[PDB]
Design an enzyme around this catalytic site. Structure first.
Site, PDB file in Angstrom:
ATOM      1  N   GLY A  14       0.630  -1.201  -0.129  1.00  0.00           N
ATOM      2  CA  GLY A  14       0.081  -0.064   0.027  1.00  0.00           C
ATOM      3  C   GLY A  14       1.019   1.374  -0.086  1.00  0.00           C
ATOM      4  N   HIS A  43      -6.230  -1.145  -0.303  1.00  0.00           N
ATOM      5  CA  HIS A  43      -7.141  -0.250   0.127  1.00  0.00           C
ATOM      6  C   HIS A  43      -6.814   1.136   0.232  1.00  0.00           C
ATOM      7  CE1 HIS A  43     -10.784   0.227   1.954  1.00  0.00           C
ATOM      8  NE2 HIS A  43     -10.528   0.790   2.982  1.00  0.00           N
ATOM      9  N   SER A  44      -5.599   1.641  -0.116  1.00  0.00           N
ATOM     10  CA  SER A  44      -5.216   2.879  -0.138  1.00  0.00           C
ATOM     11  C   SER A  44      -5.943   3.660  -1.150  1.00  0.00           C
ATOM     12  CB  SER A  44      -3.738   3.146  -0.104  1.00  0.00           C
ATOM     13  OG  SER A  44      -3.064   2.895   0.921  1.00  0.00           O
ATOM     14  N   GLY A  49     -11.241  11.304   0.391  1.00  0.00           N
ATOM     15  CA  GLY A  49     -11.514  12.629   0.949  1.00  0.00           C
ATOM     16  C   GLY A  49     -10.431  13.543   0.573  1.00  0.00           C
ATOM     17  N   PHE A 141     -12.165  19.503   5.051  1.00  0.00           N
ATOM     18  CA  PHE A 141     -12.366  18.067   5.174  1.00  0.00           C
ATOM     19  C   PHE A 141     -11.527  17.581   6.520  1.00  0.00           C
ATOM     20  CE2 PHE A 141     -10.983  13.761   4.779  1.00  0.00           C
ATOM     21  CZ  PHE A 141     -11.972  12.862   4.336  1.00  0.00           C
ATOM     22  N   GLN A 255     -12.026   3.212  14.799  1.00  0.00           N
ATOM     23  CA  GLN A 255     -12.928   4.310  14.317  1.00  0.00           C
ATOM     24  C   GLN A 255     -13.684   4.018  13.441  1.00  0.00           C
ATOM     25  OE1 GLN A 255     -10.819   8.020  12.003  1.00  0.00           O
ATOM     26  NE2 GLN A 255     -11.478   8.954  14.226  1.00  0.00           N
ATOM     27  N   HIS A 257     -17.188   5.221  10.644  1.00  0.00           N
ATOM     28  CA  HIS A 257     -17.393   6.360   9.739  1.00  0.00           C
ATOM     29  C   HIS A 257     -19.010   6.496   9.865  1.00  0.00           C
ATOM     30  CE1 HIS A 257     -17.214   8.798   5.939  1.00  0.00           C
ATOM     31  NE2 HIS A 257     -18.465   8.495   5.948  1.00  0.00           N
ATOM     32  N   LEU A 267     -18.476   3.439   0.921  1.00  0.00           N
ATOM     33  CA  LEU A 267     -18.191   4.792   1.473  1.00  0.00           C
ATOM     34  C   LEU A 267     -18.874   5.670   0.803  1.00  0.00           C
ATOM     35  CD1 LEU A 267     -17.531   5.813   3.754  1.00  0.00           C
ATOM     36  CD2 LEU A 267     -15.308   6.195   3.335  1.00  0.00           C
ATOM     37  N   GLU A 270     -17.678  12.323   3.179  1.00  0.00           N
ATOM     38  CA  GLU A 270     -18.246  13.108   4.158  1.00  0.00           C
ATOM     39  C   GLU A 270     -18.431  14.637   3.593  1.00  0.00           C
ATOM     40  OE1 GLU A 270     -15.454  14.231   7.390  1.00  0.00           O
ATOM     41  OE2 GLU A 270     -15.712  16.193   6.842  1.00  0.00           O
ATOM     42  N   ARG A 301     -17.714  14.136  13.356  1.00  0.00           N
ATOM     43  CA  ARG A 301     -18.164  12.588  12.977  1.00  0.00           C
ATOM     44  C   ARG A 301     -18.390  11.962  13.994  1.00  0.00           C
ATOM     45  NH1 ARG A 301     -14.698   9.864   7.719  1.00  0.00           N
ATOM     46  NH2 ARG A 301     -15.331  11.432   6.216  1.00  0.00           N
ATOM     47  N   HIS A 369     -14.068   1.785  10.131  1.00  0.00           N
ATOM     48  CA  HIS A 369     -13.556   2.351   9.094  1.00  0.00           C
ATOM     49  C   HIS A 369     -12.166   2.337   9.108  1.00  0.00           C
ATOM     50  CE1 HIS A 369     -13.098   5.592   5.899  1.00  0.00           C
ATOM     51  NE2 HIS A 369     -12.328   6.104   6.605  1.00  0.00           N
ATOM     52  N   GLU A 393      -1.343   2.315   8.460  1.00  0.00           N
ATOM     53  CA  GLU A 393      -2.474   1.832   9.350  1.00  0.00           C
ATOM     54  C   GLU A 393      -1.930   0.529  10.185  1.00  0.00           C
ATOM     55  OE1 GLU A 393      -6.010   1.666   7.382  1.00  0.00           O
ATOM     56  OE2 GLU A 393      -7.186   1.006   9.095  1.00  0.00           O
ATOM     57  N   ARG A 404      -8.080   9.244  15.149  1.00  0.00           N
ATOM     58  CA  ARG A 404      -6.996   9.780  13.861  1.00  0.00           C
ATOM     59  C   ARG A 404      -8.103  10.802  13.268  1.00  0.00           C
ATOM     60  NH1 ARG A 404     -10.803   8.828   9.585  1.00  0.00           N
ATOM     61  NH2 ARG A 404      -9.586   9.170   7.587  1.00  0.00           N
TER      62      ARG A 404
END
Ligand SMILES: *Cc1cc2c(cc1C)nc1c(=O)[nH]c(=O)nc-1n2C[C@H](O)[C@H](O)[C@H](O)COP(=O)(O)OP(=O)(O)OC[C@H]1O[C@@H](n2cnc3c(N)ncnc32)[C@H](O)[C@@H]1O
Ligand SMILES: *Cc1cc2c(cc1C)nc1c(=O)[nH]c(=O)nc-1n2C[C@H](O)[C@H](O)[C@H](O)COP(=O)(O)OP(=O)(O)OC[C@H]1O[C@@H](n2cnc3c(N)ncnc32)[C@H](O)[C@@H]1O
Ligand code: NA
Ligand code: NA
Lengths: 655, 655
Positions: A14, A43-44, A49, A141, A255, A257, A267, A270, A301, A369, A393, A404
């Site tokens: 990643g 996943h990166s 956002g 953001f 965390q 979302h 997703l 936001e 959030r 998330h 991560e 985070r």
């Protein structure tokens, strides 16, 4: 026996892994990057956002700098982060953007003129001066006052990852995909590489190196509902934990979302809420104002997610065949606003929800998330197991603490990749390793034996039913709201689930390309990981950051200004071993106080915070009066480290 | 750094190397075979005489067995061989043929009937019974009374090598050509692999293994005139000697062939003399009868070569622009006899000598052919440097002593490959190695430094002129006839040549595909090898086997029933260090006596030989009378070892 040697072994393709691979290859270290899948599919690539970095280019970015970014991060972490690491971060973030920019990342630019802008504190217009034109833009953001989230249109993660992957190809890094690290090779408390399984051939191969870095991403798939890709199962974390030496930090710090599409978990950026998106209940009632009259659906959030869960508990949630959800109404933003600013959100809902966000409402619900927890490291990125590093991560470099910052994770991947990349490179070049074939043979024959035993097990348990049961337990008991009674129930069941997972039997007997056999050894790892999160969530009797204990609503700065450290020293034990690392306030540039969001005075104040606070006020004022820059003041409050290469200051517009 | 790992590393892709590679791969050991050139182009492919093995199939083979073969070998060695090893050999040779036969080697077969045959003791006809039909044939070769040289028409080496190479491909052995071993990796007296130079890319790579085997062939190209391929320069021997630990055995034991084509050195099979070929001088005079009235041109090779040199010295040699030679006349055998039985000899002379052997005479002269000397090993094939093995012509397993038997060298390559292959395989599977990167790095950086220094040398010496001067010195002073005065002259000059070789400068500066740079590091190795042969030839004051000292004509069984052991413990010394390993008569199945060929009573008898001889006569008679097979008797005279796999007896026709 099959053995592959390289100076620097990287597990994970990643952002963090690839960038670290660049740092070691560029300085003559032969480096291999191992990955479950092609590296540019990590996943990166999903990030949309943006990346947080204090450039201070745009109008809303003007005035921004390391200090502001640093503070949002620390107060955001609820004081659970290593502030020195956070400093290393904020300082290097600017140069990560610029380097990526030099590498072709198509960052959205600023153009002279006025533009329609939503501040929802004044949905007024913004003006960008002419001397700002052509510089890297930023967007609102992460809830930071200063707009510093850089982006490449709506595919930031995508473009970022591609640039780093391509640099790796340019430097001739060895990228080996469909290869999985299933165990770490170690002797006398030092890491010598990893035992790897070729997912295609099924061969067990030993990869030895002078240094090994784990950048395996998050462990989000231990939950049923998550935004994460299906490959984020924490096995990277697991193999580290299974050495009995390395430790996991704050695994309970998960965390969520608030607006992922329900139930897929795809997703919905936001920007929906930020632009005006409305949250409604079963009756179509806009309820956020009910709970947050002021901020309303623009609250942090953390808050929104809690409110959405509360409302549902109050019985105002929508009944669906996959569970209860709520509604996200973006239609009220107009059709023209969506097809130009949220053209990508409109595709998500159509392709996966079968709806036009401009005509209908999208089913939503908070979901797992990001994983703040991970392999614990020092500021250099090295674990308790010498020669083993971690970045991204998958780690607990800890700059996130218990929350985070939105925009800080992709930022950390690249930044940590740069900094840990340096320290890692140095370790590899300088350290000298003693590779014993007896040990390599033990670990390789060990995993071959294991695979064989899996294929021959007459057990009657089903791996999928065991796996699915685990994700339900986690969702129902280790989510947004947690209480002791339920956590004990979860821990007990996860531990039972772990034991049954060892009586799994699989239909397909082959050793190559066997998805069933993959689940066979992975699920048990996933369970040991879940236990650390669950049990750590049970033992932490306080409410901090993303960790909310209903039976312990206040943040305890007296007994819990620490960090949970999980280990599994005895392979025979069935529950993780927890210990705590105390956060020394005397080393904090910012003393524990109010975080900004949520209730107030909701924290058992620690007396040393106050004492330290003065020490801060004192030292600050004396130097501030004696004519001293923010730099000299910072150095006086908390000196941090940085590889020579990244010690330079960050030039900004208006210097 | 580049590192390649395998359980079993094999340096050399000839018969011995490839067969050994089969032995380690077939039992699950990952094995790499390194070679200068494609493996099926090794010098082994040049063999056209045949392979010696006691099958006893043909009429002239009838009665043959391990004992007869064993004896020819020991008396042939002039008692300089390890008789136990010779036993291991003769016993396994039969099964090497049969295995190769099972692998497709197209061995010439026997067919019922009478055939024209030349025995030159009676050029009569031979009859092959019907029960012999279809079995592996044999030919008269090597001077043995019993015809046991098996062959595949006129390309025995060719077919043999191809079968073994193909088995390697079948077993999936890793064959890496255009790769040269330039140094051995060792620490604490144990071998961990080799530093290798990729002849194409120029990369210096470290190949580590639990066991390393050197099967690099002979060092024949240190002479100007030799039958050897241009790649037989003894560098394999050199890298072993340069460890300062491993030793070289009987390097002065060099064997010459009497009839190679002059001056190319292209071999003209021994069948020329055997069929009737005539040796003539400058006047066309058939001279062999002059010196050997009895055997004439059918005397042992050893003798013929000496006579040819004597005659030339008597001034009866032919004057040519490349030196003096003699003539080989095969024309007198008739045209029909050549175009059917020596059809291949007719092509050699036309293509390379521009003559029809059936119409004209071929220019000939004795030249270097086989290297009895080599890396010294125990009966298992292991050197003084633990983990380092050797097999084939590159070794001094020693079954040849001072005169290898014609037909025994290709035989040894395959046999040793089988036996050493087993011991080697066992070593690799059982031993456990400690690989330190610090050491790998020392050797790899060491050779990189060396290459660089070569490319940057401002020296004014020419590598080719230095190399050519070396081969002249060797030809003129270390050939068939040797005397102290000249040997001292040679040693002194070789030592000077060695020193100047370190002031070589090369025009081409690149590191890849650089033939000039190859010569740059090879010649110095070739010189250290030549010094061992020359200096060992000077110190051995006696005449044994191929070693003929004019000033010391008699074979000294009192002071020289030993083995020369060369080493180079100090990298700074300029002359090899010699020591001697005494051959213990009490362990000999056959006591030192007359060899069969040449003068008689030409040896200082050792008193312990006689004592031992009785011990032999005694023990033999007692058991021979007490009704005991040749097997039990052998076991009583000298018990030897053999891997379990090759312990079985050899079934024969008429059992
Ligand atoms: C899920 C998600 C996260 C996210 C986001 C949107 C979504 C849908 N948007 C973000 C945003 O706008 N801004 C931001 O700052 N963060 C955002 N995030 C989170 C962020 O993307 C992640 O924190 C970040 O991408 C993590 O990067 P990292 O480099 O650590 O990891 P990765 O991309 O997941 O890749 C992990 C690699 O590891 C390989 N792997 C895993 N396990 C193994 C084993 N056992 N063996 C071998 N290889 C392994 C994977 O194949 C992968 O390549
Ligand atoms: C020259 C010759 C020899 C010969 C013969 C005819 C000729 C012209 N006829 C024979 C016969 O009829 N019967 C017999 O018994 N022997 C005969 N011989 C001698 C015999 O062929 C040899 O003793 C035998 O072939 C030796 O086999 P061996 O397996 O030991 O060696 P090789 O074939 O020469 O191959 C050596 C390999 O080593 C590689 N090499 C060498 N140095 C290096 C380094 N430094 N690094 C890497 N690789 C290396 C070579 O490339 C080769 O493959
Ligand atoms: Na983490
Ligand atoms: Na030899």
């Amino acid at each position: 026996m099959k053995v592959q040697y390289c100076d620097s072994l990287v597990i994970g393709g990643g952002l963090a892994g690839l960038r670290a691979a660049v740092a070691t290859q560029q300085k003559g270290l032969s480096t291999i990057v191992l990955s479950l899948i092609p590296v540019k599919r990590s996943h990166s690539a999903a990030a949309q956002g943006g990346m947080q970095a204090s450039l201070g280019n745009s109008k809303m970015s003007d005035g921004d700098n390391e200090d502001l970014h640093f503070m949002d991060t620390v107060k955001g972490s609820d004081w659970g982060c290593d502030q020195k690491v956070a400093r290393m971060f904020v300082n290097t973030a600017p140069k990560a953007i610029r380097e990526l920019a030099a590498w072709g990342v198509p960052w959205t630019r600023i153009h002279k003129g006025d533009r329609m802008a939503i501040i929802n504190a004044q949905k007024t217009t913004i003006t960008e001066e002419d001397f700002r034109h052509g510089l890297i833009h930023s967007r609102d953001f992460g809830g930071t006052k200063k707009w510093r989230t850089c982006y490449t249109a709506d595919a930031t993660g995508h473009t970022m990852l591609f640039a780093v992957a391509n640099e790796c190809l340019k430097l001739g890094v060895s990228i080996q995909d469909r290869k999985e690290a299933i165990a770490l090779i170690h002797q006398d408390g030092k890491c010598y590489g990893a035992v790897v399984r070729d997912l295609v051939t099924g061969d067990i191969i030993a990869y030895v190196a002078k240094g090994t870095l784990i950048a395996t991403g998050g462990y989000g798939r231990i939950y049923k509902n998550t935004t994460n890709a299906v490959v984020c199962e924490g096995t990277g974390t697991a193999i580290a934990l299974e050495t009995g030496i390395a430790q996991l930090g704050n695994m309970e710090a998960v965390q969520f979302h608030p607006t992922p599409l329900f139930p897929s978990g795809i997703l919905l950026t936001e920007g929906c809420r930020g632009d005006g998106g409305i949250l409604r209940d079963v009756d179509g009632h806009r309820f956020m104002p009910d709970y947050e009259p002021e901020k309303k659906e623009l609250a942090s959030r953390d808050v929104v997610s809690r409110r959405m869960i509360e409302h549902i508990r109050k019985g105002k949630g929508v009944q669906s065949p996959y569970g209860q959800h709520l509604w996200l109404d973006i239609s009220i933003l107009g059709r023209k606003h969506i097809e130009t600013n949220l053209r990508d959100v409109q595709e998500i809902c159509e392709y996966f929800a079968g709806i036009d966000p401009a005509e209908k409402w999208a089913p939503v619900l908070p979901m797992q998330h990001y994983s703040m927890g991970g392999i614990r490291t020092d500021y250099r990125g090295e674990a308790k197991l010498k020669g083993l590093f971690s970045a991204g991560e998958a780690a607990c470099w800890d700059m996130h603490g218990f929350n985070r910052l939105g925009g800080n994770s992709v930022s950390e991947a690249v930044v940590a990749g740069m900094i840990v990349g340096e320290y890692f490179a140095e370790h590899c070049a300088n350290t000298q390793v003693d590779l014993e074939t007896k040990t390599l043979e033990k670990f390789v024959k060990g995993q071959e034996a294991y695979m064989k035993s899996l294929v021959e097990s007459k057990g009657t348990e089903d791996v999928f039913k065991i796996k699915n049961r685990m994700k339900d337990v986690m969702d129902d008991n280790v989510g947004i709201f947690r209480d002791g009674p339920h956590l004990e129930k979860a821990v007990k069941e996860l531990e039972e689930l772990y034991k049954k997972s060892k009586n799994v039997g699989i239909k397909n007997k082959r050793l190559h390309a066997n998805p069933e056999l993959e689940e066979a050894y992975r699920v048990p790892m996933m369970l040991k990981v879940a236990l650390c999160v669950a049990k750590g969530a049970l033992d932490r009797t306080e409410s901090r950051g993303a960790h909310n204990r209903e039976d312990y609503p206040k943040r305890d700065d007296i007994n819990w200004l620490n960090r949970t450290l999980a280990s599994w020293p005895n392979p025979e034990q069935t529950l993780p071993t927890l210990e705590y690392e105390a956060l020394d306030v005397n080393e904090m540039e910012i003393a524990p106080g109010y975080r900004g969001y949520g209730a107030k005075g909701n924290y058992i104040e620690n007396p040393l915070s106050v004492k330290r606070q003065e020490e801060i006020d004192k030292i600050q004022s004396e130097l501030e009066a004696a004519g001293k820059d923010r730099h000299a003041i910072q150095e006086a409050l908390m000196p941090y480290e940085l590889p020579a290469k990244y010690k330079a200051r960050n030039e900004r517009l208006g210097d």
